[PDB]
Amino acid sequence: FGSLKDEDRIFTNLYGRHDWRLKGAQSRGDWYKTKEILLKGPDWILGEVKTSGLRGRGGAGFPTGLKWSFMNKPSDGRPKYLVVNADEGEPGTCKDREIIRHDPHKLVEGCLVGGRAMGARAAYIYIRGEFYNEASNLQVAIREAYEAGLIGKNACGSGYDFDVFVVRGAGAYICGEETALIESIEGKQGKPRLKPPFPADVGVFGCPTTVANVETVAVSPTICRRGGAWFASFGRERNSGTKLFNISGHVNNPCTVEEEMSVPLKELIEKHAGGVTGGWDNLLAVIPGGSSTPLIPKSVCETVLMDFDALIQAQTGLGTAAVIVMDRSTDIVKAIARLIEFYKHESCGQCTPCREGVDWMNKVMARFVRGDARPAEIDSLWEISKQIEGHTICALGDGAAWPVQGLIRHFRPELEERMQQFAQQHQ
Amino acid sequence: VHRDTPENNPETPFDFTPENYKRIEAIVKNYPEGHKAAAVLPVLDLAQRQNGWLPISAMNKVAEILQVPPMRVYEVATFYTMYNRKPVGKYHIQVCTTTPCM
Amino acid sequence: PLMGWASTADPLSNLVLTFSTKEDAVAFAEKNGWSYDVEERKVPKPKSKSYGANFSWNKRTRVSTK
């Protein structure tokens, strides 16, 4: 990992933000060399990302480099599409929508340059309609370029070019899975399918699709434009790259910054800009993932670098790329229930473990917080959480327990004493 | 809230402005043919827009356009959130309350 | 005609013996010497059922709202 950073220069993977929002020639960075890329054999791009080997921003492992050079090697009778989440499911994510808001010109390229690797046919994106204003403008961004003849059907210089069809959702979590999105792109109700039909690259719209994420297809052109040998810059021999973090919930100026891997949380939280709560003596009870990781106390987290597998060393890792912390007044038990009260409303409801199994917790979590009937429950409530893992289809269950699974870990007494606080009270 | 209708506007009636039948040419043009069969997500919502909340005769209408048995619509309008089945106001306001927002 | 219990003769009327197989089934009708009849065992077709054929390009089997 080198020098234990993760610095930020003007040399980064994102071109500009406050400079130019509208269309043009991509005055400096973008749309630079194209006809040379596409005219060379497609699999040249395939595995040429391996110089980086992006883990992927979809909240998981499984480097993006494999799945595209993965099946969808051949082609037979039926077209292939691209479905790239723009959605945000996790509370406090916020990383998305900043990419789109002030610089859309990147991703329409990101597909066209990207889609050629798939050998795909069309391009769908998807956006939660809950963003009405910013999402409305992409069409202009599509038009303001696409109208110039930059895309389709040969554009430019190849015999292969195809346009991008925006769509919208409503009350979606649906980006909560692939093999759901490709279902509610269709117009059924969205109940995500079983994971191994034929996994997500066989059963699809009518025909094989691949579900990418935003900065997985956003940073691909610039990492195939230059690459290197700088493609692997920070992070150890395992995880490599520089992703975006967006700090939220206590800071001086919670705001995004581009930061490379293996950055410790004690300098990163304090920096960009201040630590404005107590940098210490505010107890710094932290959540690595947005909703997908339980607490860490004042322990090795602060020295624990943000590298992925570095977090699997602790009791939980995070792929979500977000930060929420706390200081003093926020009662964690009080502040984790409204993370659970959230889950109960976003779940499909097919499976018997998820449905009727999350409420069993959510109905009891309003006992502990309020303070109420006796311990030895905690010992059970742990087993429930241990009882939903292989039992649910999607990850929302595997992402349902961890907050409670990792609350019972790391804080014993805060509960034990409160059940007394109402016990002595009853007396 | 309850998800059954007490026969409010079975015939409201309702219809789309003839300015809107020229866009639905464009929506269906997105998709491939023969699978079209659901554009329902924009098309059902565009109807909310023309009105401002969609009564039960709105749910029955698009079926005559999209030829799907209209329990393959009443379903989709009771899953998502953004659609408002009951009437509403001129401003429908939200307060984000969640762990960070808390 | 006092209560409505349905009283009866036909003193067998309730016996079910249980044999293990046909070859040894008829074994006990002859050996005790009364008439009889036979039915046949039934088991299903093989059969062929595959999930994941339910989402199809040109096939006519394509389910919605499952």
């Binding site: 409305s136 202009v140 599509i142 038009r143 109208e147 346009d163 | 043919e33 | 199809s56 390009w57 040109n58």
Partner: peptide, 28 residues
């Protein structure tokens, strides 16, 4: 900013410039 009026967004440049589609069939 334009509350209604997705029209030309959907039907102006998109309508003419979304070729072909071939999209096949799927009769079914």
């Amino acid at each position: 900013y334009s509350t209604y009026t997705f029209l030309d967004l959907n039907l102006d440049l998109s309508k003419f410039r979304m070729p072909q589609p071939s999209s096949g069939r799927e009769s079914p």
